[PDB]
Symmetry: D2
Subunit: 33 residues, 4 copies
């Protein structure tokens, strides 16, 4: 695959990981309270 | 073990995910170039 | 509430594993260049 | 170099494999808590 298609895949993985970080941060806040 | 210590671990995992999300965004930029 | 929390973490864990597989596949392809 | 990017993607994949297992471990802890 061209580098552009690679970049496209990585940006979708990046936003999924960011979403999952927010999910864990929210759970962590719950548990720490 | 304390529940706060679990919450702390989840905070750390979330940190790795925020960091990885940024790293992938950066790499995607690099490849877009 | 710990049972629902456990279930959420398992959901996220599966998602991270799947994303790891995806990145490894992408890494293989870029390394073959 | 595309080799350096590939190596970095393999490393981010490792972080994700590791996090996935950590979350599964924490989920188990919470389930028996
Ligand atoms: Zn970094
Ligand atoms: Zn660990």
């Amino acid at each position: 695959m061209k580098l552009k298609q690679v970049a496209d895949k990585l940006e979708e993985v990046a936003s999924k990981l960011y979403h999952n970080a927010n999910e864990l941060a929210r759970v962590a806040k719950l548990l720490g309270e």
